[PDB]
Amino acid sequence: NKPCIISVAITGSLPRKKDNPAVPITVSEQVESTQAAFEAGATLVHLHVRNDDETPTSNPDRFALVLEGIRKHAPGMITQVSTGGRSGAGNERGAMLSLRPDMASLATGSVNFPTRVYDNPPELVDWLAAEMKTYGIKPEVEAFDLSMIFQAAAMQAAGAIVGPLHIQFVMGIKNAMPVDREVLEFYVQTLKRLSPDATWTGAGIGRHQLTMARWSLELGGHCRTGLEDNVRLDKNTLAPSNAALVRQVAELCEEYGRPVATAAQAREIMSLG
Amino acid sequence: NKPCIISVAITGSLPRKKDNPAVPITVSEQVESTQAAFEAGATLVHLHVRNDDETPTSNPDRFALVLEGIRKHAPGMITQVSTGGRSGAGNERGAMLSLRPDMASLATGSVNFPTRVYDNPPELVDWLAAEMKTYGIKPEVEAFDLSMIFQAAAMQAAGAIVGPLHIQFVMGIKNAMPVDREVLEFYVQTLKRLSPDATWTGAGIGRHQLTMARWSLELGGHCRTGLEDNVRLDKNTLAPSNAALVRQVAELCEEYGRPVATAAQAREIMSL
Ligand SMILES: [Zn+2]
Ligand SMILES: [Zn+2]
After folding, report:
1. Which of A53, A263, A264, B118 ranks highest by number of CB atoms within 10 Å?
2. What CATH number was assigned to the domain covering residues B1-272?
3. Binding of Zn(2+): at which residues (chain B) (predicted)?
Protein backbone atom coordinates (compact mmCIF):
# COMPACT_ATOMS: atom_id res chain seq x y z
CA ASN A 1 0.00 0.00 0.00
CA LYS A 2 2.97 2.35 0.74
CA PRO A 3 4.29 4.17 -2.43
CA CYS A 4 7.64 3.04 -3.93
CA ILE A 5 10.26 5.45 -5.31
CA ILE A 6 12.02 4.29 -8.49
CA SER A 7 15.59 5.60 -8.83
CA VAL A 8 17.23 5.43 -12.27
CA ALA A 9 21.05 5.29 -12.60
CA ILE A 10 21.30 6.22 -16.30
CA THR A 11 25.03 6.06 -17.21
CA GLY A 12 27.59 5.33 -14.48
CA SER A 13 31.36 5.47 -15.07
CA LEU A 14 32.00 1.96 -16.57
CA PRO A 15 29.20 1.15 -19.18
CA ARG A 16 30.18 1.93 -22.81
CA LYS A 17 28.35 1.98 -26.22
CA LYS A 18 30.12 -1.35 -27.02
CA ASP A 19 28.40 -2.94 -23.95
CA ASN A 20 24.96 -1.54 -24.97
CA PRO A 21 24.20 1.29 -27.51
CA ALA A 22 21.29 2.37 -25.21
CA VAL A 23 23.87 3.79 -22.71
CA PRO A 24 23.49 7.62 -22.84
CA ILE A 25 26.86 9.44 -23.27
CA THR A 26 26.11 12.91 -24.77
CA VAL A 27 24.08 15.68 -23.01
CA SER A 28 21.12 15.17 -25.45
CA GLU A 29 21.24 11.35 -24.95
CA GLN A 30 21.24 11.67 -21.11
CA VAL A 31 18.35 14.21 -21.09
CA GLU A 32 16.22 12.08 -23.52
CA SER A 33 17.00 8.80 -21.64
CA THR A 34 16.08 10.47 -18.28
CA GLN A 35 12.80 11.93 -19.70
CA ALA A 36 11.76 8.46 -21.04
CA ALA A 37 12.62 6.86 -17.65
CA PHE A 38 10.66 9.68 -15.88
CA GLU A 39 7.59 8.95 -18.10
CA ALA A 40 8.05 5.22 -17.24
CA GLY A 41 7.72 5.94 -13.48
CA ALA A 42 11.21 6.97 -12.27
CA THR A 43 11.18 9.98 -9.86
CA LEU A 44 14.90 10.13 -8.92
CA VAL A 45 17.79 10.31 -11.40
CA HIS A 46 21.26 9.15 -10.30
CA LEU A 47 23.57 11.11 -12.61
CA HIS A 48 27.13 10.40 -13.81
CA VAL A 49 28.50 12.49 -16.73
CA ARG A 50 30.93 11.47 -19.51
CA ASN A 51 33.32 13.06 -21.99
CA ASP A 52 32.55 12.77 -25.76
CA ASP A 53 35.03 9.80 -26.00
CA GLU A 54 32.89 7.99 -23.28
CA THR A 55 35.59 8.44 -20.55
CA PRO A 56 34.26 9.28 -17.03
CA THR A 57 34.42 12.92 -15.79
CA SER A 58 33.29 15.10 -12.87
CA ASN A 59 33.19 18.20 -15.21
CA PRO A 60 30.73 20.70 -13.59
CA ASP A 61 29.97 22.34 -16.99
CA ARG A 62 28.83 18.94 -18.37
CA PHE A 63 26.74 18.38 -15.17
CA ALA A 64 25.17 21.90 -15.52
CA LEU A 65 23.96 21.20 -19.12
CA VAL A 66 22.40 17.80 -18.23
CA LEU A 67 20.77 19.07 -14.95
CA GLU A 68 19.21 22.03 -16.89
CA GLY A 69 17.75 19.63 -19.51
CA ILE A 70 16.38 17.29 -16.79
CA ARG A 71 14.64 20.19 -14.93
CA LYS A 72 12.94 21.29 -18.22
CA HIS A 73 12.05 17.84 -19.72
CA ALA A 74 11.35 15.97 -16.43
CA PRO A 75 9.77 18.62 -14.09
CA GLY A 76 9.63 17.65 -10.40
CA MET A 77 12.13 14.78 -10.84
CA ILE A 78 14.72 14.52 -8.03
CA THR A 79 18.26 15.17 -9.31
CA GLN A 80 21.06 13.15 -7.67
CA VAL A 81 24.67 13.79 -8.78
CA SER A 82 27.36 11.16 -8.28
CA THR A 83 30.45 12.05 -6.22
CA GLY A 84 32.26 8.85 -7.28
CA GLY A 85 35.75 8.79 -8.73
CA ARG A 86 39.12 7.08 -9.24
CA SER A 87 41.64 6.35 -6.42
CA GLY A 88 43.75 9.42 -5.60
CA ALA A 89 41.07 11.92 -6.73
CA GLY A 90 40.26 14.44 -4.00
CA ASN A 91 38.00 17.56 -3.98
CA GLU A 92 37.50 17.19 -7.80
CA ARG A 93 34.85 14.52 -6.94
CA GLY A 94 32.60 17.25 -5.46
CA ALA A 95 33.28 20.10 -7.93
CA MET A 96 29.66 19.92 -9.30
CA LEU A 97 27.94 20.32 -5.89
CA SER A 98 27.72 24.18 -6.22
CA LEU A 99 25.14 23.58 -9.06
CA ARG A 100 22.74 22.80 -6.16
CA PRO A 101 21.10 19.48 -7.27
CA ASP A 102 18.39 17.97 -4.99
CA MET A 103 20.70 15.16 -3.82
CA ALA A 104 24.25 13.74 -4.11
CA SER A 105 25.69 10.24 -3.54
CA LEU A 106 27.97 9.85 -0.53
CA ALA A 107 30.10 6.73 0.07
CA THR A 108 30.85 6.85 3.84
CA GLY A 109 33.62 4.24 3.66
CA SER A 110 36.07 2.37 1.46
CA VAL A 111 35.41 -1.05 -0.14
CA ASN A 112 37.05 -3.40 -2.67
CA PHE A 113 35.69 -3.23 -6.23
CA PRO A 114 36.11 -5.87 -9.06
CA THR A 115 39.55 -4.58 -10.25
CA ARG A 116 40.56 -1.89 -7.69
CA VAL A 117 39.86 -0.34 -4.26
CA TYR A 118 36.94 2.11 -4.17
CA ASP A 119 38.84 4.69 -2.09
CA ASN A 120 36.89 7.14 0.05
CA PRO A 121 39.36 8.69 2.55
CA PRO A 122 37.77 9.90 5.85
CA GLU A 123 38.92 13.49 5.02
CA LEU A 124 37.13 13.26 1.62
CA VAL A 125 33.91 11.81 3.20
CA ASP A 126 33.88 14.75 5.72
CA TRP A 127 34.55 17.36 2.97
CA LEU A 128 31.86 16.00 0.57
CA ALA A 129 29.25 15.91 3.40
CA ALA A 130 30.14 19.51 4.46
CA GLU A 131 29.85 20.73 0.81
CA MET A 132 26.39 19.07 0.42
CA LYS A 133 25.24 20.79 3.67
CA THR A 134 26.60 24.14 2.43
CA TYR A 135 24.63 23.89 -0.88
CA GLY A 136 21.43 22.50 0.74
CA ILE A 137 21.94 19.06 -0.86
CA LYS A 138 20.41 15.95 0.78
CA PRO A 139 23.01 13.12 0.79
CA GLU A 140 22.24 9.58 -0.33
CA VAL A 141 24.56 7.38 1.70
CA GLU A 142 26.01 4.62 -0.47
CA ALA A 143 26.44 1.64 1.86
CA PHE A 144 28.71 -0.88 0.09
CA ASP A 145 29.46 -2.61 3.44
CA LEU A 146 28.03 -2.85 7.01
CA SER A 147 30.40 -0.26 8.68
CA MET A 148 29.14 2.44 6.27
CA ILE A 149 25.69 2.32 7.96
CA PHE A 150 27.37 2.94 11.36
CA GLN A 151 29.45 5.78 9.85
CA ALA A 152 26.29 7.39 8.33
CA ALA A 153 24.47 7.19 11.72
CA ALA A 154 27.51 8.62 13.61
CA MET A 155 27.71 11.53 11.07
CA GLN A 156 23.94 12.25 11.42
CA ALA A 157 24.31 12.20 15.26
CA ALA A 158 27.23 14.70 15.09
CA GLY A 159 25.26 16.97 12.71
CA ALA A 160 27.52 16.24 9.69
CA ILE A 161 24.38 14.94 7.85
CA VAL A 162 21.16 17.00 8.38
CA GLY A 163 17.59 15.61 8.50
CA PRO A 164 16.42 11.97 8.09
CA LEU A 165 18.96 9.64 6.42
CA HIS A 166 18.42 8.11 3.01
CA ILE A 167 20.72 5.15 2.59
CA GLN A 168 21.28 2.87 -0.37
CA PHE A 169 22.27 -0.76 0.30
CA VAL A 170 24.46 -1.82 -2.66
CA MET A 171 24.80 -5.57 -3.42
CA GLY A 172 26.18 -7.71 -6.28
CA ILE A 173 29.56 -6.02 -6.84
CA LYS A 174 32.52 -8.46 -7.13
CA ASN A 175 34.89 -8.17 -4.07
CA ALA A 176 32.32 -5.99 -2.21
CA MET A 177 29.02 -7.16 -0.62
CA PRO A 178 27.33 -10.07 -2.50
CA VAL A 179 23.53 -10.24 -2.87
CA ASP A 180 22.33 -11.87 0.39
CA ARG A 181 18.79 -11.80 1.90
CA GLU A 182 19.92 -12.25 5.57
CA VAL A 183 22.49 -9.40 5.28
CA LEU A 184 19.86 -7.06 3.71
CA GLU A 185 17.45 -7.91 6.57
CA PHE A 186 20.26 -7.20 9.08
CA TYR A 187 21.03 -3.91 7.19
CA VAL A 188 17.36 -2.78 7.65
CA GLN A 189 17.26 -3.92 11.35
CA THR A 190 20.59 -2.09 12.02
CA LEU A 191 19.40 1.11 10.23
CA LYS A 192 16.13 1.01 12.26
CA ARG A 193 18.14 0.64 15.53
CA LEU A 194 20.60 3.51 14.75
CA SER A 195 18.33 5.88 12.73
CA PRO A 196 14.57 5.05 13.24
CA ASP A 197 13.22 7.72 10.82
CA ALA A 198 15.63 6.81 7.99
CA THR A 199 14.45 5.74 4.50
CA TRP A 200 16.33 3.24 2.31
CA THR A 201 16.82 1.89 -1.25
CA GLY A 202 18.07 -1.57 -2.21
CA ALA A 203 20.41 -1.63 -5.22
CA GLY A 204 21.54 -4.70 -7.20
CA ILE A 205 24.28 -4.90 -9.86
CA GLY A 206 24.09 -7.17 -12.94
CA ARG A 207 21.73 -10.19 -12.97
CA HIS A 208 20.67 -9.40 -9.34
CA GLN A 209 19.15 -5.98 -10.29
CA LEU A 210 15.52 -7.25 -10.15
CA THR A 211 16.24 -9.52 -7.12
CA MET A 212 17.21 -6.46 -5.01
CA ALA A 213 14.13 -4.56 -6.33
CA ARG A 214 11.82 -7.46 -5.24
CA TRP A 215 13.44 -7.61 -1.74
CA SER A 216 13.22 -3.79 -1.34
CA LEU A 217 9.48 -3.87 -2.16
CA GLU A 218 8.92 -6.74 0.39
CA LEU A 219 10.97 -5.13 3.21
CA GLY A 220 9.38 -1.65 2.87
CA GLY A 221 12.25 0.00 1.00
CA HIS A 222 12.61 1.77 -2.35
CA CYS A 223 14.00 0.61 -5.73
CA ARG A 224 16.91 1.43 -8.05
CA THR A 225 17.50 0.35 -11.67
CA GLY A 226 19.31 1.59 -14.80
CA LEU A 227 22.10 0.82 -17.30
CA GLU A 228 24.77 1.99 -14.76
CA ASP A 229 24.12 -1.20 -12.71
CA ASN A 230 22.95 -3.59 -15.48
CA VAL A 231 22.85 -3.41 -19.33
CA ARG A 232 20.73 -6.59 -19.77
CA LEU A 233 16.89 -6.74 -19.71
CA ASP A 234 17.30 -10.54 -19.18
CA LYS A 235 20.06 -13.20 -19.67
CA ASN A 236 19.58 -13.27 -23.51
CA THR A 237 18.46 -9.63 -24.20
CA LEU A 238 20.18 -6.22 -23.85
CA ALA A 239 18.05 -3.38 -22.42
CA PRO A 240 16.86 -1.10 -25.30
CA SER A 241 16.70 1.90 -22.87
CA ASN A 242 16.73 3.00 -19.20
CA ALA A 243 12.89 3.38 -19.48
CA ALA A 244 12.62 -0.40 -20.29
CA LEU A 245 14.45 -1.21 -17.01
CA VAL A 246 12.20 1.26 -15.08
CA ARG A 247 9.12 -0.53 -16.56
CA GLN A 248 10.41 -3.87 -15.11
CA VAL A 249 10.51 -2.28 -11.60
CA ALA A 250 7.13 -0.51 -12.17
CA GLU A 251 5.63 -3.97 -13.04
CA LEU A 252 7.11 -5.42 -9.79
CA CYS A 253 5.46 -2.49 -7.88
CA GLU A 254 1.94 -3.56 -9.06
CA GLU A 255 2.83 -7.23 -8.25
CA TYR A 256 3.67 -6.33 -4.60
CA GLY A 257 0.63 -3.98 -4.33
CA ARG A 258 2.83 -0.89 -3.86
CA PRO A 259 1.99 2.11 -6.12
CA VAL A 260 4.76 3.82 -8.11
CA ALA A 261 5.47 7.09 -6.24
CA THR A 262 4.87 10.39 -8.09
CA ALA A 263 7.48 13.22 -8.13
CA ALA A 264 5.57 15.05 -5.29
CA GLN A 265 5.25 11.83 -3.21
CA ALA A 266 8.97 10.96 -3.69
CA ARG A 267 10.03 14.43 -2.38
CA GLU A 268 7.66 14.00 0.62
CA ILE A 269 9.03 10.48 1.50
CA MET A 270 12.67 11.71 1.48
CA SER A 271 11.75 15.02 3.27
CA LEU A 272 12.88 17.27 0.34
CA GLY A 273 11.79 20.80 -0.67
CA ASN B 1 34.01 -26.12 29.23
CA LYS B 2 35.61 -25.73 25.74
CA PRO B 3 39.30 -24.54 25.85
CA CYS B 4 40.08 -20.91 24.92
CA ILE B 5 43.11 -19.85 22.82
CA ILE B 6 44.82 -16.63 23.93
CA SER B 7 46.47 -14.73 21.06
CA VAL B 8 49.03 -12.06 21.96
CA ALA B 9 49.69 -9.12 19.58
CA ILE B 10 53.00 -7.96 21.11
CA THR B 11 54.06 -4.82 19.15
CA GLY B 12 51.97 -3.68 16.17
CA SER B 13 53.00 -0.82 13.85
CA LEU B 14 51.78 2.23 15.89
CA PRO B 15 52.67 1.74 19.66
CA ARG B 16 55.94 3.45 20.73
CA LYS B 17 58.17 3.52 23.88
CA LYS B 18 56.67 7.02 24.62
CA ASP B 19 53.17 5.40 24.80
CA ASN B 20 54.41 2.57 27.10
CA PRO B 21 58.06 1.45 27.75
CA ALA B 22 56.75 -2.18 27.95
CA VAL B 23 56.27 -2.14 24.11
CA PRO B 24 58.94 -4.53 22.69
CA ILE B 25 60.96 -2.98 19.79
CA THR B 26 64.31 -4.88 19.58
CA VAL B 27 64.67 -8.62 18.72
CA SER B 28 65.68 -9.44 22.36
CA GLU B 29 62.70 -7.40 23.74
CA GLN B 30 60.17 -9.14 21.42
CA VAL B 31 61.51 -12.65 22.23
CA GLU B 32 61.45 -12.04 26.05
CA SER B 33 57.99 -10.32 25.92
CA THR B 34 56.62 -13.31 23.89
CA GLN B 35 58.17 -15.89 26.29
CA ALA B 36 56.61 -14.10 29.34
CA ALA B 37 53.20 -13.97 27.54
CA PHE B 38 53.60 -17.70 26.63
CA GLU B 39 54.26 -18.55 30.32
CA ALA B 40 51.15 -16.44 31.21
CA GLY B 41 48.90 -18.62 28.98
CA ALA B 42 49.23 -17.22 25.43
CA THR B 43 49.59 -19.95 22.74
CA LEU B 44 49.55 -17.75 19.61
CA VAL B 45 51.83 -14.79 18.88
CA HIS B 46 50.72 -12.11 16.38
CA LEU B 47 54.03 -10.62 15.24
CA HIS B 48 54.89 -7.18 13.80
CA VAL B 49 58.59 -6.19 13.57
CA ARG B 50 60.21 -2.75 13.94
CA ASN B 51 63.41 -0.95 12.99
CA ASP B 52 65.78 0.19 15.81
CA ASP B 53 64.28 3.76 15.59
CA GLU B 54 60.79 2.16 16.33
CA THR B 55 59.54 2.72 12.71
CA PRO B 56 57.40 -0.14 11.23
CA THR B 57 59.02 -2.61 8.77
CA SER B 58 58.24 -5.86 6.89
CA ASN B 59 62.03 -6.75 6.89
CA PRO B 60 62.23 -10.60 6.54
CA ASP B 61 65.69 -10.67 8.23
CA ARG B 62 64.21 -8.98 11.34
CA PHE B 63 61.25 -11.46 11.23
CA ALA B 64 63.68 -14.44 10.92
CA LEU B 65 65.64 -13.42 14.10
CA VAL B 66 62.46 -12.97 16.22
CA LEU B 67 60.77 -16.19 14.91
CA GLU B 68 63.98 -18.18 15.73
CA GLY B 69 64.00 -16.81 19.30
CA ILE B 70 60.27 -17.57 19.77
CA ARG B 71 60.70 -21.22 18.58
CA LYS B 72 63.55 -21.72 21.11
CA HIS B 73 62.15 -19.79 24.15
CA ALA B 74 58.42 -20.57 23.61
CA PRO B 75 58.32 -24.15 22.16
CA GLY B 76 54.99 -25.23 20.66
CA MET B 77 53.67 -21.63 20.50
CA ILE B 78 51.81 -20.82 17.26
CA THR B 79 53.64 -18.15 15.25
CA GLN B 80 51.63 -15.63 13.22
CA VAL B 81 53.27 -12.91 11.09
CA SER B 82 51.50 -9.67 10.11
CA THR B 83 51.08 -8.82 6.41
CA GLY B 84 49.85 -5.27 7.17
CA GLY B 85 51.28 -2.16 5.54
CA ARG B 86 50.82 1.40 4.20
CA SER B 87 48.73 2.44 1.12
CA GLY B 88 50.57 1.74 -2.14
CA ALA B 89 52.74 -1.06 -0.67
CA GLY B 90 52.48 -4.23 -2.77
CA ASN B 91 54.11 -7.70 -2.55
CA GLU B 92 56.72 -6.43 0.03
CA ARG B 93 53.89 -6.83 2.64
CA GLY B 94 54.33 -10.61 2.17
CA ALA B 95 58.14 -10.83 1.81
CA MET B 96 58.47 -12.75 5.13
CA LEU B 97 56.04 -15.60 4.15
CA SER B 98 59.01 -17.76 2.87
CA LEU B 99 60.11 -18.08 6.57
CA ARG B 100 57.15 -20.53 6.94
CA PRO B 101 55.47 -19.36 10.20
CA ASP B 102 52.51 -21.45 11.45
CA MET B 103 50.11 -18.62 10.54
CA ALA B 104 49.84 -15.15 8.90
CA SER B 105 47.32 -12.28 9.00
CA LEU B 106 45.20 -11.72 5.89
CA ALA B 107 42.90 -8.69 5.44
CA THR B 108 40.43 -9.83 2.73
CA GLY B 109 39.10 -6.33 2.04
CA SER B 110 39.67 -2.58 2.37
CA VAL B 111 38.33 -0.44 5.24
CA ASN B 112 38.70 3.14 6.54
CA PHE B 113 41.12 3.62 9.45
CA PRO B 114 41.29 6.63 11.91
CA THR B 115 43.54 8.80 9.63
CA ARG B 116 43.76 6.88 6.30
CA VAL B 117 42.34 4.04 4.16
CA TYR B 118 43.58 0.56 5.08
CA ASP B 119 44.17 -0.45 1.44
CA ASN B 120 44.10 -4.13 0.51
CA PRO B 121 43.74 -4.34 -3.31
CA PRO B 122 42.01 -7.55 -4.58
CA GLU B 123 45.22 -8.47 -6.52
CA LEU B 124 47.25 -8.14 -3.25
CA VAL B 125 44.71 -10.24 -1.25
CA ASP B 126 44.94 -13.02 -3.94
CA TRP B 127 48.78 -12.88 -4.04
CA LEU B 128 49.18 -12.99 -0.20
CA ALA B 129 46.75 -15.96 0.04
CA ALA B 130 48.55 -17.83 -2.80
CA GLU B 131 51.93 -17.26 -1.04
CA MET B 132 50.51 -18.63 2.27
CA LYS B 133 49.08 -21.69 0.40
CA THR B 134 52.53 -22.21 -1.24
CA TYR B 135 54.43 -22.11 2.12
CA GLY B 136 51.84 -24.23 4.04
CA ILE B 137 50.80 -21.19 6.12
CA LYS B 138 47.35 -21.16 7.74
CA PRO B 139 45.87 -17.66 7.21
CA GLU B 140 44.09 -15.68 9.90
CA VAL B 141 41.46 -13.65 8.10
CA GLU B 142 41.28 -10.12 9.53
CA ALA B 143 37.61 -9.12 9.25
CA PHE B 144 37.40 -5.33 9.78
CA ASP B 145 33.96 -5.28 8.08
CA LEU B 146 31.09 -7.69 7.17
CA SER B 147 32.01 -8.23 3.43
CA MET B 148 35.45 -9.60 4.50
CA ILE B 149 33.70 -12.67 6.00
CA PHE B 150 31.97 -13.32 2.63
CA GLN B 151 35.30 -12.81 0.79
CA ALA B 152 37.06 -15.30 3.15
CA ALA B 153 34.30 -17.92 2.60
CA ALA B 154 34.38 -17.41 -1.22
CA MET B 155 38.21 -17.86 -1.18
CA GLN B 156 37.94 -21.07 0.91
CA ALA B 157 35.27 -22.41 -1.51
CA ALA B 158 37.53 -21.68 -4.54
CA GLY B 159 40.50 -23.39 -2.81
CA ALA B 160 42.44 -20.10 -2.32
CA ILE B 161 42.38 -20.79 1.46
CA VAL B 162 43.13 -24.39 2.59
CA GLY B 163 41.52 -26.18 5.56
CA PRO B 164 39.12 -24.82 8.21
CA LEU B 165 38.97 -20.98 8.24
CA HIS B 166 40.16 -18.94 11.18
CA ILE B 167 38.73 -15.45 11.20
CA GLN B 168 39.36 -12.52 13.54
CA PHE B 169 36.50 -10.06 14.10
CA VAL B 170 38.10 -6.64 14.74
CA MET B 171 36.10 -3.91 16.63
CA GLY B 172 36.76 -0.46 18.13
CA ILE B 173 38.78 1.17 15.32
CA LYS B 174 37.66 4.74 14.44
CA ASN B 175 36.05 4.89 10.91
CA ALA B 176 35.95 1.05 10.74
CA MET B 177 33.57 -1.27 12.69
CA PRO B 178 32.62 0.07 16.17
CA VAL B 179 32.19 -2.21 19.20
CA ASP B 180 28.68 -3.72 18.87
CA ARG B 181 27.27 -6.92 20.45
CA GLU B 182 24.52 -7.44 17.81
CA VAL B 183 27.03 -7.12 14.89
CA LEU B 184 29.40 -9.64 16.58
CA GLU B 185 26.46 -12.06 17.05
CA PHE B 186 25.56 -11.58 13.34
CA TYR B 187 29.28 -12.10 12.42
CA VAL B 188 29.24 -15.51 14.24
CA GLN B 189 25.83 -16.50 12.72
CA THR B 190 27.09 -15.52 9.22
CA LEU B 191 30.40 -17.41 9.66
CA LYS B 192 28.47 -20.53 10.86
CA ARG B 193 26.18 -20.31 7.76
CA LEU B 194 29.06 -19.86 5.22
CA SER B 195 31.82 -21.96 6.90
CA PRO B 196 30.40 -24.35 9.60
CA ASP B 197 33.79 -25.78 10.73
CA ALA B 198 35.47 -22.33 11.01
CA THR B 199 37.04 -21.05 14.24
CA TRP B 200 37.07 -17.38 15.28
CA THR B 201 38.71 -14.79 17.56
CA GLY B 202 37.18 -11.53 18.79
CA ALA B 203 39.58 -8.56 18.96
CA GLY B 204 39.02 -5.19 20.66
CA ILE B 205 41.10 -2.00 20.47
CA GLY B 206 41.94 0.12 23.55
CA ARG B 207 39.23 0.06 26.25
CA HIS B 208 37.29 -2.50 24.12
CA GLN B 209 40.10 -5.13 24.42
CA LEU B 210 38.57 -6.81 27.52
CA THR B 211 34.96 -6.22 26.26
CA MET B 212 35.68 -8.26 23.09
CA ALA B 213 37.48 -10.91 25.22
CA ARG B 214 34.34 -11.30 27.44
CA TRP B 215 32.03 -11.54 24.37
CA SER B 216 34.33 -14.08 22.61
CA LEU B 217 34.31 -16.31 25.76
CA GLU B 218 30.48 -16.12 25.92
CA LEU B 219 29.88 -16.78 22.19
CA GLY B 220 32.30 -19.76 21.94
CA GLY B 221 35.17 -17.89 20.29
CA HIS B 222 38.83 -17.28 21.14
CA CYS B 223 40.61 -14.25 22.64
CA ARG B 224 43.24 -11.71 21.58
CA THR B 225 45.16 -9.20 23.73
CA GLY B 226 48.51 -7.40 23.72
CA LEU B 227 50.20 -3.97 23.57
CA GLU B 228 49.49 -3.71 19.78
CA ASP B 229 45.76 -3.12 20.56
CA ASN B 230 45.97 -1.54 24.07
CA VAL B 231 48.81 -0.15 26.26
CA ARG B 232 46.74 0.34 29.48
CA LEU B 233 45.92 -2.27 32.19
CA ASP B 234 43.11 0.05 33.41
CA LYS B 235 42.02 3.75 33.06
CA ASN B 236 44.78 4.88 35.53
CA THR B 237 47.58 2.31 34.91
CA LEU B 238 49.81 1.38 31.94
CA ALA B 239 50.37 -2.35 31.24
CA PRO B 240 53.84 -3.36 32.62
CA SER B 241 54.12 -6.13 29.96
CA ASN B 242 52.23 -8.21 27.35
CA ALA B 243 52.15 -11.05 29.97
CA ALA B 244 50.11 -8.76 32.32
CA LEU B 245 47.47 -8.30 29.57
CA VAL B 246 47.46 -12.11 28.90
CA ARG B 247 46.86 -12.63 32.69
CA GLN B 248 43.70 -10.40 32.46
CA VAL B 249 42.31 -12.67 29.68
CA ALA B 250 43.42 -15.87 31.54
CA GLU B 251 41.43 -14.59 34.61
CA LEU B 252 38.35 -14.04 32.37
CA CYS B 253 38.71 -17.62 30.99
CA GLU B 254 38.33 -19.08 34.56
CA GLU B 255 35.44 -16.63 35.25
CA TYR B 256 33.52 -17.96 32.17
CA GLY B 257 34.38 -21.60 33.02
CA ARG B 258 36.59 -22.12 29.94
CA PRO B 259 40.15 -23.48 30.47
CA VAL B 260 43.16 -21.68 28.94
CA ALA B 261 44.19 -23.83 25.93
CA THR B 262 47.69 -25.37 25.95
CA ALA B 263 50.05 -25.14 22.92
CA ALA B 264 49.03 -28.71 21.84
CA GLN B 265 45.27 -27.96 22.29
CA ALA B 266 45.57 -24.64 20.38
CA ARG B 267 47.24 -26.45 17.42
CA GLU B 268 44.49 -29.16 17.44
CA ILE B 269 41.68 -26.49 17.50
CA MET B 270 43.39 -24.59 14.61
CA SER B 271 43.86 -27.92 12.70
CA LEU B 272 47.67 -27.26 12.57
ZN1 LIG C 1 26.84 5.86 -9.37
ZN1 LIG D 1 48.53 -6.65 13.49
Report:
1. B118
2. 3.20.20.70
3. 46, 48, 228
